[model samples]
Target: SLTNSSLMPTLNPMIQQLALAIAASWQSLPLKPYQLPEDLGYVEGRLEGEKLVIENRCYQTPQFRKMHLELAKVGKGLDILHCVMFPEPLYGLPLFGCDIVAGPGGVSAAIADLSPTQSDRQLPAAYQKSLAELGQPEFEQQRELPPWGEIFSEYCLFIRPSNVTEEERFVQRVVDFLQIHCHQSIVAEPLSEAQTLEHRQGQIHYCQQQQKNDKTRRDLEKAFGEAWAERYMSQVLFDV
Candidate 1:
């Protein structure tokens, strides 16, 4: 049993600083995984027929692309998505049908939502209905996908407003709730809920994206604190 992953540690919120931390953590995810081609390569293929297809090559044969298939099998995508759960929990989500169908812009994430069509696949009506409810398709440019916002909403995370008025009110409400629940002392970093939400919005500028782990790590370190990173990053690396 791994103790480190056992519980969501309630970091010392310092009452005054508590709310800001909560607000920051609850901020919406800024980029969809499929949108970050620099980090996660375009989904050239999918996991099907007991194999993984990539870049239009049938990587199904042991002699053909075994290493390529193995590499894709352990991708960090699911890992990054899992991180969202630590800071944000969910109620329901379809366990299957998440894929990257070949497309124009690039590979986009998708979840199966068709029911009658699913029945043809031998899935029962009741079971299919459950998935339909849990894994709703998110469309983009006339195509449906299971990108960040769609996934977040299906998991009961996003408070998608029906209209502009409700959107404003609901956002303010979550912000206030977070502020009330966390450290009140973080007044200096007082970004409104909407501000945090906007900062957390999907669709990042690919031009300015970080592609490598070392580069990303260093950037994060610098963004947080240079002095702290200089002292602690080395220790953190050694431990990992």
Candidate 2:
């Protein structure tokens, strides 16, 4: 059975706090539980001498097919948080995704975006307006997206936060994005059948682009085996 609990205390404070914030926002949206592969919901393993724990929570709303939040801790050193909200194609909303990688050295990478699925590669007008109004937060180190990152929107934020203040800012920014997305998605109207088909293609493209992130695969493969990593990546993380 899956229990709703706090993140691992041994993990980085930034990730723990962000996980809470994400859960709170999701609850506020009043989502319903979504089923996952029975054995895949919560996983445990040994990575070298350290323990690896993965907790995945899934929910859905009328506008979204799946809203997945994954929080994992590998020993006391590495903590990871990932979230993706996949909209129903008929609604034509963009995907909302965010990821954080932190370790003893500090947060190395933090990224969040409401990625567009349209061929034109642009966010919806309402999303654009709301995000523009929110404005951008300043960070010491901004990171560039990978080659396959064209799926992300202009509002995408990828950064390496240098201090506690920056980490908090990043968390708040993600919360803001989540709030806006949830509101917009709820109010969005369904598109025509042809448009829905186009949106589905866009979603597939987005997943394909995300699957190209070798870093995620490498870390999982190191902890689990090659076959297990591939299965987790395809069946759980970025299944299309």
Candidate 3:
């Protein structure tokens, strides 16, 4: 049973709010529990003699194959929130993902996107129209996408929020993107077999690209062992 109070207590307020918002949005949708390995649900480790904790929540809906939310903390120094919604291959919906990393210095990175699962790497027409109409909010410290980030859509947002106000704005933007994605997913039609295969390939490619993020892997390898890090990254984080 997931509860709002269960979020990492000492995380940045912005990250906490965003995690709550993400959970609320999912609860508002038609969803059912999705099972993962019991050990992966709640994990504890030691990183540099500091306590490391990880919590995961997962669910599924008719339109979405899997929706995962992960909250993690490394003692009092670092906090992280990560989420991804992988659409059903039959339904041609874009994958939605967001991440926030907060250190003692405040939020170092925040990013969200409705990444396309098509070979063209462009969002669907409805998504493009809705996202375009919503307009972009200004962030003082926008960040660059990684080289493998070609999988992201044109409307992807990556930023380093400088103040509390900016952090709140980022959370709101994520909510907006989520609402749009959920609404669009409900009305999305299933594609033909060939189209489904294409989208499935796109998803595989996206997962592959994400697995190239060595920073995440390295951190996990340090905290856990190399074998456990590999398993977590492939089996839990980006399993295609």
**TM-scores of all predicted structures:** 0.18, 0.93, 0.96
Tens digit per residue, CA lDDT, model 2, 1-240: 123554556667788877888887887776888888898888888877888889888888888888898988877688899999888899998889999999988888899988887767788888888888978789787887778887888888899998899999999998898888888877899899998999999989888888998777887788888999999887788778
Candidate 2 clashing pairs? none
Between candidates 1 and 3, name the one with more favorable TM-score.
3
Alpha carbon RMSD to native, model 1: 21.4
Model 3 CA lDDT for position 73 = 88
- lDDT agreement of model 2 with the native: 0.84
Q: Give the TM-score of candidate 1.
A: 0.18
> How would you encode candidate 3's per-residue C-alpha lDDT over 173-233 as one tens digit per residue?
9999998998998788889999999988988998899888888889899999899999998
Which ranking of candidates, highest TM-score first? 3, 2, 1
Query: What is model 2's C-alpha RMSD?
Result: 2.0
lDDT of 1 by residue, 1-240 (tens): 112321112211121122233226333323112112242222222222222211201111111110010012212121111111111101111111112121222222222221111112233344445434544323223333223223222222222223334433333333343333222212123345554333222112110121122432463344445664343223221111
Off by over 4 Å in 2: 1-6
Model 3, residue 54: what's the lDDT? 86
Query: Which stretches of candidate 3 lie above 4 Å from their native place?
Result: 1-7
